[PDB]
Design a protein around this ligand. Structure first.
Ligand SMILES: [Mg+2]
Ligand SMILES: [Mg+2]
Lengths: 258, 468, 468, 258
DNA sequence: ACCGACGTCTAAGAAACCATTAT
DNA sequence: ACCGACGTCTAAGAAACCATTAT
């Protein structure tokens, strides 16, 4: 880059390079469908995936809850070195690492976690709407410098609810890992998003480049807690457990000059 | 968090009458004149009607208000004053005589009430039979479907527009289909400009063309359409080509991929022999329009990726002296951009009031990059000479870039994005500034839909003037 | 008393399909096939019609008779039987469909009645409009001008042929004009041979070419035309270039002499700047068509004499290693030659029964020579293998030679005479054995008339196929 | 020359190299137009031209008829040495030499002299058609060995007349002077040549190499009196006058072998 | 105290027309 | 014993069906 105007993306660089996860070697054969069935029935406090052996991040008591003692043969550790191309080549690793990063991001922090069409959303709670950490986001969605609501009900709707949210995705291009953000208006319940499309269109009608810049900055502040610190924010998944994943994610969005 | 330096491609220039350039198309037509007016072709644009006798006055009203000036009322930042057909195109628009006005049979109303769309299309084409022997007395025909026929327009696997266009393609008579959308719209300038440019193009003329375009280059676009039935589905993949002849002129044609009829495929990707057939057929047109010379470089654009088989077919279908360019256009991506202005006097760096410029491309990796076909463009504004215009502002608060993946190439991104940007404005069917996708893909998709509707018109080369 | 020793050069050989040599064009075409047939370009010759609806019958009749064999009736000594288009050219002649048969508007008859020739040409092109859309579907268009338009054919300062050719040339559409001459002539084989060869040449084919050609030589011919107006006179000068590429080609193009538009000359001889400009354009075209090498030796032919500035420009536009030959062509001379047979058997020295053989050149002085481009040729006669044939026996009882003036050169007359004689046979527009003038001069004359008629098409190089 | 067939031209070599003309010096300046006007009005028995002084061939009584004694300053002599170079360089000298040669050739012989389009023609007289010297030309024009008419009335015209003739021209090439002959059918009156074009075309239609050779030989014999004698024929113009020109022109036409 | 207007004369060709079709 | 039916998962586009019109 050499000159202006500048281009600001929505991609946050990921600096981590290795994940030390654990394996679950079981004598009897396991498939993904029954694995997810057991996860649904038991509700583990951990994330589990299946490439060729059951891979997990969290505490052993969980997988001892999901698997009886006879089924589990031995437990070891897996070194996922060269995370980027492993995520690119293996889809299960991509989804697993994306879930781990999101769960690390949304820990001890008052933002709800939601999924739509197998995509992850960070949605602000109704109860904690007036919290001080959301002042910047309230300012961004405001009109003529006035404070704006960041949660409410949909006009001319029976029981529809709307909230301001951000969609987080994981993307791998050229050996570098990027976290992508996109502001979006989440609707509760999920299956009644048909009834509020006029509302979302009206709310997003005037979110021009300047307002979108402020919204993105406010969401970066909410997600990471610091802005323009010049460094990186360290996030971890289940720090108390043995097998834990730590990540180094920068706070400055990828940009380009002329 | 520092990417490679981006570059912005200057807005491509359009060529008009007397070989003189202007970026804004409607402004160029209003003030300079159409490019084909240099050769006085068409000398006149004779006109023909096909409407039910209950809706004749609508046709007379639309042609009259085409012939009269109209002022913009919506999106006035872009649309300029419309000065009528004669003042803009410098050729008259001749109203049809008594014998050049056609009446559809009354059985069309019954067929529409029965909901059988194919019978409706057949009845319309049979009603227009009286015009075949008088084809010498006119050039472009208008067909009108009133709002009472909405229910026979689009149902499962059927399309009245594509069916009628396929039926009239071999009859060699351009048509322009108008419904109540054109007659019940607030912004009259929108409709008048679009219809006027479309009628002039269907008359055989060239409204405008790219200013700086090389005659040794060819461009190919491949798209596919899906038809589903009880047993399953098959892919109707077609092709299209943009290039200019050795002499001054424009021709834009599309043709089917299927080497023989009744060849069935279940995936969009093309076989080795299929690529050989299609690319050798394209070579035939290129040599025919350039006195048998070889193209020095070829561009192929697809909506899907290229497998090793497709790459080998493309590489073997051309000579060794011609460089081969394969580019996949990914419309929807996870990236968007925000524009930041530099320090201007006292004020520091801050987000711009208008979105990212159109022409900005960001190289992501060795073979993948995003180019902004959507954005703000300067120099086309009418209300405020100094304020840029971003057209998709009424629907999208921010442009969405398209994402380009290369499979073969030695030269840099400059030529590729320059060509892709240049081809975004040459859609005469478009009354706006540009298209999100290059016109090659647009025509490929339209012809794919038409061939999917009617597969009896394969292996016949057809130009844009029949499907715009 | 006695002049210097003369010489005769062999009648030059024409190259045909699979590199076969035949002196007789028509015989070689009927017996071996056209040169481009081995590379099968075009794969087929597709036709289109341009005539009023009352005269389409004559067009289908002439195409039918083109498709059927015919036998010579007049001048049978050199004239061979026509074996049909597909038999002789090994490539079918397709009869055009309903969508490829164009009808001229009724306004043409009124325009002809009112005598406005320019309006007539405009109306013809306006009629042919749709063929611009359909040009992918065919190769060559047949245009018929009825005898009712005779009053607008050629009057003072106007020419319908040149106007129509100039208007359709940028459109890259080769056309053929048919009059009542081709339809009311007793010898049908002449019409058949000429029309078939012209159509094959216009479709992109090479009917024949000289056998032994050096690819390191270029040939240039400059001719001028006279335009009359009230102000005075303007001299339209145009240049024609003949050469062959490195492989399987034949470049026969003409281009204007004017550096800028509206540069008026009152005298045929061009200035130093104009000579440098035109000769450099010739060098650039040869450079483009010869992979970047320069010609070893260059021929320039002109109708009038070379002034000193022209010679200086010719010497300065090329390098030192490339020899340059300047040759004058003079049609009218005071000399004629008589052939006297030698002593054979008992018959003493007596004049021969047939005139002097074509190819005989008489060196007059160190700078002037008389070349017999008209004469008798051996090995061509069909009735009697041993009897010589003289083409213009029904025109000139005796051949009248042309005279050559060398303005610069150290070599002999053999090379220049051979080149000039060989360049007299590749005029594909005629049906006879040879032309009195080299093809460069006649093409430059034709393009001079075209440019003088329409001066708006300058600065574009054009191939022979559009003006034959 | 080394072999046959032979090429026979229309050119007769001229052996003379110098012409002694007379100079008529005018006290008052004179122009070509007035000189021609005086020539037409007086009809002198001499030939005159004007390069820078009036050059004449003929007798002093003639130019004293044209010029009054007051105007004439002095009379002298002029040597045109190297006639070929002077004729090539000077146009008026070329015309004067051509006229002098023609007048010397057509002296004391029954051949009419006519001029058409700046060209010189030798026409056979109508009255003297049956002369014995014309037998060769009559044979050359007839068909299948039959004697043919030389002059007659054109077909289907009021009083148009025709007679067979030869065009005499002078040409300079490379320092050597040649006389050119071209047989051509004269029409009287001159201005009505267009009305008999079909007639001439019919007459010359089969005049192939044989007939052309015979006609050329007959015309050479008629003009010079000898054919192929190996010598030169001497002709003089105005031999009685003081200023006269004599020429040596061979009878054998220039030819080429090899 | 000149280089422009006009006459003569060569050569050479081009433009609105005419006419035949190969001893 | 090899390869053919099903499940999971990414990217990515099109059978379709509603909008609003450029700070
Ligand atoms: Mg359209
Ligand atoms: Mg043409």
């Amino acid at each position: 880059g050499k000159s202006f105007p500048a281009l600001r993306t929505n991609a946050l660089p990921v600096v981590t390079q290795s994940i030390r996860c654990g394996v679950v070697t079981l004598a009897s054969p396991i498939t993904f469908s029954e694995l997810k069935e057991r996860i649904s029935q038991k509700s583990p406090k951990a994330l589990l995936t299946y490439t060729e052996k059951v891979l997990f991040l969290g505490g052993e008591p969980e997988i001892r809850k999901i698997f009886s003692n006879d089924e589990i043969n031995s437990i070891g550790q897996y070194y996922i070195d060269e995370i980027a191309q492993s995520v690119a080549a293996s889809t299960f690793l991509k989804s697993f690492v994306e879930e781990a990063i999101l769960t690390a991001l949304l820990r001890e922090k008052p933002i709800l976690h939601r999924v739509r069409h197998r995509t992850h959303y960070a949605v602000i709670p109704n109860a904690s709407a007036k919290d001080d950490r959301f002042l910047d986001l309230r300012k961004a969605v405001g009109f003529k410098g006035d404070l704006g609501y960041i949660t409410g009900n949909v006009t001319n709707a029976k029981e529809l609810s709307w909230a301001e949210a951000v969609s987080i995705r994981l993307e791998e291009r050229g050996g570098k890992l990027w976290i992508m953000l996109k502001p979006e208006i989440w609707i509760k319940p999920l299956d009644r998003r048909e009834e509020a499309t006029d509302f979302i269109r009206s709310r997003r009608r005037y979110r021009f480049n300047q307002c979108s810049y402020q919204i993105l900055d406010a969401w970066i502040k909410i997600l990471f807690g610091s802005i323009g610190g010049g460094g990186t924010v360290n996030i971890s998944c289940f720090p108390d457990a043995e097998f834990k994943a730590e990540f180094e994610i920068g706070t400055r969005t990828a940009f380009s000059l002329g | 968090s520092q990417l490679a330096a981006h570059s912005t491609i200057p807005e491509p220039l359009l060529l008009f009458k007397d070989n003189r350039t202007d970026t804004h198309p409607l402004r160029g037509l209003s003030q300079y004149g159409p490019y084909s007016a240099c050769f006085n072709l068409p000398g006149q644009v004779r006109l023909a009607y096909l409407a039910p006798t209950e809706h004749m006055r609508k046709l007379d009203a639309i042609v009259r208000e085409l012939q009269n000036p109209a002022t913009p009322k919506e999106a006035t930042n872009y649309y300029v004053e419309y000065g009528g057909f004669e003042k803009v195109f410098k050729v008259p628009l001749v109203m049809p005589q008594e014998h050049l006005r056609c009446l559809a049979l009354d059985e069309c109303h019954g067929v529409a009430a029965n909901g059988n769309g194919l019978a409706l299309a057949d009845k319309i084409v049979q009603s227009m039979s009286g015009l075949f022997r008088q084809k010498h007395a006119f050039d472009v025909l208008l067909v009108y479907l009133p709002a009472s026929w909405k229910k026979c327009f689009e149902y499962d696997g059927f399309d009245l527009h594509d069916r009628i266009k396929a039926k009239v393609a071999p009859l060699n008579l351009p048509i322009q289909i108008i419904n109540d959308t054109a007659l019940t719209r607030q912004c009259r300038a929108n409709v008048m400009w679009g219809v006027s440019v479309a009628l002039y193009a269907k008359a055989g003329g060239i409204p405008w063309k790219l200013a700086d375009w090389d005659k040794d280059e060819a461009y190919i676009g491949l798209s596919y359409a899906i038809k589903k039935n009880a047993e399953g589905q098959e892919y109707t993949t077609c092709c299209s080509q943009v290039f200019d002849p050795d002499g001054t002129g424009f021709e834009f044609v599309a043709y089917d991929t299927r080497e023989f009829i009744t060849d069935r495929k279940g995936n969009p990707y093309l076989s080795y022999q299929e690529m050989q057939s299609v690319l050798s057929k394209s070579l035939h047109l290129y040599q025919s329009s350039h006195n048998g010379r070889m193209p020095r470089k070829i561009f192929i654009h697809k909506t899907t990726h290229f497998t090793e088989d497709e790459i080998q077919g493309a590489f073997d279908s051309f000579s060794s002296s011609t460089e081969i360019e394969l580019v996949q256009i990914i419309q929807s991506t996870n990236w968007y951009g925000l524009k930041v202005d530099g320090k201007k006097g006292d004020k520091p760096v801050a987000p711009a009031s208008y979105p990212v410029d159109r022409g900005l491309y960001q190289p992501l990796t060795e073979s993948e990059c995003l180019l902004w076909t959507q954005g703000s463009v300067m120099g086309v504004n009418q209300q405020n000479p100094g304020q840029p215009v971003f057209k998709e502002a009424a629907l999208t608060p921010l442009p969405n870039p398209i994402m380009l993946r290369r499979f073969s190439g030695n030269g840099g991104w400059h030529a590729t994005c320059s060509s892709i940007l240049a081809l975004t404005k040459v859609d005469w069917n478009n009354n706006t500034l540009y298209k999100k996708l290059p016109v090659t893909l647009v025509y490929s998709q339209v012809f794919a839909d038409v061939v999917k509707q009617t597969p009896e018109i394969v292996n016949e080369i057809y130009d844009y003037r029949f499907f715009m």
